[PDB]
């Protein structure tokens, strides 16, 4: 049970990083739009 909880926490961290990874693409697109404007 303790190992299962640890694995669940690790999966939570992995998916949090997965969602956070979109920030680079968003910033690059914002810079592209700012250059276009």
């Amino acid at each position: 049970d303790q190992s299962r909880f640890n694995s669940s926490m690790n999966e939570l961290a992995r998916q949090q990083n997965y969602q956070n990874q979109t920030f680079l693409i968003q910033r690059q697109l914002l810079q592209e739009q700012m250059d276009a404007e």
Binding site: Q2, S3, N6, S7, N10
Partner: protein, 455 residues
């Protein structure tokens, strides 16, 4: 002492048996640089390599497993205790020779790209066990180790955890070797007057109150710290020293624990022992050490069935000795150690033994070990009584094992010549059997020149 991971999940025929191929030290890497990949700054990670190979491996500054570049022939060592699940071979791209261990921490550890296996399927391996050799299946010419950590026994990237990040946040003990034994003339504990200055337990107990922490050396209570590499060189290596077997201050202090916990938790026993030692004219430390060895560190003082030959008491009262003292072995075992000190004093008050007791620790040890004839042989032939010819139950070994529980070794004339000559080797690197190297690595210091302290 549980080497490797010690997280609170691991807590729960006629032929000669050889010891398992287990090492006592493991490699650790501390990165103070700015080479960052997501693992927390300044953390220590335990590599699956031997501690002697810590400096010869590289972390390599894209897949789910970390690659550690190591020279060809290095041995992969299991950092956690567990059961080997499967040992197979996949020829081609991934997992050339891979071994999976179900660690007691609940996570599966996989070591791939190996050259040979040293374990078997379904074998229980302890921490520090030798697993196998590194391979070059991926890039010929350069050897490495594919290290992967999983929560399941699958074969995919779903469930993979970065080994470095995982090792950064787990509680582990990187070394299991005992600290070196030397001189503790200054590392004494008095229950009535506790020391004012203390250092972290991972320090090295140098003689005369000196210590070594984090590549810096100094004295207790002195804020001035000198560099380890500047003061301790090849000309003057780190020597833990020895305690003289015939020199003492001449006064016994009540409450002086001499590094023993039983004396600290029983101050009345310490006071009575100091009284007895002062009355006998001998140092309290010698009698303390002898009684601690003879009773397994005061855990078998009142045990009347541990010894199959009928030996009980603080100083190991034999039935003949008990009859001589006017009592029986069972009564001596029943009485508390404070009461047994009276009988110890009575036995040591023998005129065939008392005059020679003050000459050194060796005389007291001989009197307690062999009695009057051993003492007489010592007086007539000091060198003859300490012969090392076979026996294995001679007085030399008895003096060797004195003070082991607290880290004290005695330098006795006509006995320690072999210890001084054999132990006069200087190490400039890490060696597995050396306890001083393990202490140096555990203290955080680099491997400075030091004397050889094996066992």
């Amino acid at each position: 002492g549980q080497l490797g991971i010690t997280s609170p999940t691991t807590a729960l025929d006629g032929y000669r048996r050889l010891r398992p191929p287990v090492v006592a030290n493991l490699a650790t890497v501390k990165f103070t640089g700015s080479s960052r990949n997501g693992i927390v700054p300044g953390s220590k990670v335990m590599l699956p390599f031997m501690a002697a190979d810590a400096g010869r491996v590289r972390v390599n500054s894209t897949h789910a497993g970390e690659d550690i570049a190591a020279p060809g022939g290095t041995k992969v060592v299991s950092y956690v205790s567990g059961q080997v699940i499967k040992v197979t071979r996949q020829k081609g791209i991934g997992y050339g020779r891979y071994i999976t261990i179900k660690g007691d921490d609940g996570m599966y550890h996989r070591f791939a790209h190996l050259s040979a296996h040293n374990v078997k399927q379904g074998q229980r391996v302890e921490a520090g066990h030798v697993i196998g050799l590194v391979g070059d299946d991926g890039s010929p010419g350069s050897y490495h180790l594919h290290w992967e950590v999983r929560d399941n026994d699958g074969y995919g990237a779903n469930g993979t955890v970065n080994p470095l990040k995982y090792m950064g946040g787990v509680n582990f003990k990187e070394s299991s070797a005992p600290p070196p034994q030397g001189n503790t003339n200054g590392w004494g504990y008095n229950v009535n007057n506790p020391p004012t200055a203390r250092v972290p337990a991972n320090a090295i107990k140098l003689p005369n109150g000196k210590f070594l922490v984090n590549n810096r050396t100094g004295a207790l209570g002195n804020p001035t710290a000198r560099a380890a590499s500047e003061q301790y060189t090849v000309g003057r290596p780190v020597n833990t020293g020895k305690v003289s077997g015939s020199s003492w201050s001449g006064t016994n202090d009540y409450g002086e624990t001499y590094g023993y916990a039983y004396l600290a938790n029983n101050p009345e026993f310490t006071k009575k022992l100091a009284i007895t030692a002062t009355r006998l004219g001998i140092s309290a430390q010698w009698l303390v050490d002898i009684m601690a060895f003879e009773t397994g560190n005061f855990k078998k003082a009142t045990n009347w069935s541990h010894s199959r030959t009928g030996v009980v008491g603080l100083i190991g009262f034999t039935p003949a000795t008990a009859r001589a003292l006017g009592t029986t072995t069972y009564a001596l075992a029943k009485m508390p150690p404070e009461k047994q000190l009276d009988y110890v004093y009575k036995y040591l008050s023998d005129p065939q033994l008392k005059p020679h007791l003050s000459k050194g620790v060796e005389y007291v040890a001989a009197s307690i070990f062999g009695g009057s004839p051993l003492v007489r042989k010592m007086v007539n032939n000091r060198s003859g009584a300490m012969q090392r010819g076979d026996g294995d139950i001679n007085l030399q070994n008895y003096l060797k094992k004195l003070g082991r529980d607290v880290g004290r070794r005695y330098d006795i004339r006509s006995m320690s010549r072999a210890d001084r000559l054999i132990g006069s080797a200087v190490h400039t690197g890490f060696h597995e059997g050396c306890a001083t190297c393990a202490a140096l690595r555990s203290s955080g210091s680099d491997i400075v020149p030091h004397n050889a302290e094996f066992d």
